[PDB]
Paper text:
The hormone binding globulins, corticosteroid binding globulin (CBG) and thyroxine binding globulin (TBG), are examples of naturally occurring site-specific carriers. Upon cleavage of their reactive centre loops, both hormone binding globulins undergo the canonical serpin conformational change that involves the incorporation of the cleaved reactive centre loop into the central β-sheet A as a new β-strand.
Ser 100 on the s2A/hD loop and Val 236 on the s2B/3B loop of β-sheet B were mutated to cysteines so that under non-reducing conditions, they may be induced to form a disulphide bridge. We predicted that by covalently linking the s2A/hD loop to the binding pocket, any effect caused by the movement of the loop as a result of the S-to-R conformational change would be amplified. The disulphide mutations were made on the T349R background to allow cleavage by thrombin. When binding assays were performed at 37°C in the presence of the reducing agent, TCEP, the change in binding affinity of CBG-S100C-V236C-T349R after reactive loop cleavage was very similar to that of wild-type CBG. However, in the absence of TCEP, cleavage of the reactive centre loop resulted in a 6.5-fold decrease in binding affinity for cortisol, as shown in Table 2. We went on to obtain the crystal structure of reactive centre loop-cleaved CBG-S100C-V236C-T349R, which revealed that the binding pocket was indeed perturbed by the presence of the disulphide bridge. The X-ray data also showed that the disulphide linkage has an occupancy of only about half, which suggests either that the disulphide bond is broken by radiation damage during data collection or, more likely, that even under non-reducing conditons, only about half of a given population of the CBG-S100C-V236C-T349R molecules have the desired disulphide bond at a given time.
Numbering used by the authors: 15 to 349, 352 to 383
């Protein structure tokens, strides 16, 4: 139990669902961004809408109160803000509000207290300008990495909630630039591509999993960052992914041991863009999109529903470290061992202190 375990449960569930929907595509998401955005959103919900949303995010409202959930995300946000200076990290929230709406004071107080959310004015009557405005805001917070989060063709919103996350970290064990070389990467049975393959021969935290058919290594970045690189055995990608759980992570952490490893990992430049409505509904999070949605804690002068939940994430991974960003938007409307990663593999980016799932990747093609 606890926030950390719940957020991991949600992260892996979302990941599994997205992988199932796009069997041949790279997957890249920021679970913590999505969880934080929807948790903040839940502050405005009531009744069944609220109960369903919080359950979907992995929380049990018997056993834990809503206040405790929001306190959890507050401390999480606060710790990301106070990252070690060797890690450049940004993580925050914003609410864009049309002039026609007035937030109930309790809701405005809550989003400011728990999520430190900015509250910015927009003119939804001009969706072109408003969507450009929100996009610019997110682009700036992610230092240019997340662009065009919204389009002028999206259904106009009178309220938009945004979470952004960005960081640039350096490996505690970087790869030698001079040792990078082109190698074959086997996407599938009929597809082989040329990729820049990084190499280092080091004392690496390694595990050949005895319960799942996979090998993995843990690579740290400064500022308490940990990255799991997981290589499923041939033909076992789906088996490993389907099995991912909080218990799996605990087992890996306990089983990882220092070993001499010739570690080949390719440079990774990937991205993910998602309209999360359909997959969230598969996961039981649906009522908030319907004409029966209850957002009465935002306002009682109007009945709102969510129209769209969008998510974008980008990863740049190279010899020196990891540069990554993500953003989630919610719109509302009136109702030695040789280990070579030359086949599809999994990347998990965690904050070690909180065990927050910052990013998850399924890499089908690292180029």
């Amino acid at each position: 139990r606890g926030l950390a375990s719940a957020n991991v449960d949600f992260a892996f569930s979302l990941y599994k669902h997205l992988v199932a929907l796009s069997p041949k595509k790279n997957i890249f998401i920021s679970p913590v961004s999505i969880s934080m955005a929807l948790a903040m959103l839940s502050l405005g919900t009531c009744g069944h809408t609220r109960a369903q949303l919080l359950q979907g995010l992995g929380f049990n409202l018997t056993e834990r109160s809503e206040t405790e959930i929001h306190q959890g995300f507050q401390h999480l946000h606060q710790l990301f803000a106070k990252s070690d200076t060797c890690l450049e990290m940004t993580m925050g929230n914003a609410l864009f509000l049309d002039g026609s709406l007035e937030l109930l004071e309790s809701f405005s107080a809550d989003i400011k207290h728990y999520y430190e959310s900015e509250v910015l004015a927009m003119n939804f009557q001009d969706w072109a300008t408003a969507s450009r405005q929100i996009n610019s805001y997110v682009k700036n917070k992610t230092q240019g990495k997340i662009v065009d989060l919204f389009s002028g063709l999206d259904s106009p919103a009178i309220l938009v909630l945004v979470n952004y996350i960005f960081f640039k970290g350096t490996w505690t064990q970087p790869f030698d630039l001079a040792s990078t070389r082109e190698e074959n990467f086997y996407v599938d049975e009929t597809t082989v591509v040329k990729v820049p393959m990084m190499l280092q021969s080091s004392t690496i935290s390694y595990l050949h999993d005895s319960e799942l058919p996979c090998q993995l290594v843990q690579m740290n970045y400064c500022g308490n960052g940990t990255v799991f690189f997981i290589l499923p055995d041939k033909g076992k990608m789906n088996t490993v992914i389907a099995a991912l759980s909080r218990d799996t992570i605990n087992r890996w952490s306990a089983g990882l041991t220092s070993s001499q490893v010739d570690l080949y990992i390719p440079k990774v430049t990937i991205s993910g863009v998602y309209d999360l409505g359909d997959v969230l509904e598969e996961m039981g999070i649906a009522d908030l999109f319907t004409n029966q949605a209850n957002f009465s804690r935002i306002t009682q002068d109007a009945q709102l529903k969510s129209s769209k939940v969008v998510h974008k994430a980008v990863l740049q991974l190279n010899e020196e470290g990891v540069d990554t960003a993500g953003s989630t938007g919610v719109t509302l409307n009136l109702r030695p061992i040789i280990l070579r990663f030359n086949q599809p593999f999994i990347i998990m980016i965690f904050d070690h202190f909180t065990w927050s799932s910052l990013f998850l990747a399924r890499v089908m093609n690292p180029v």
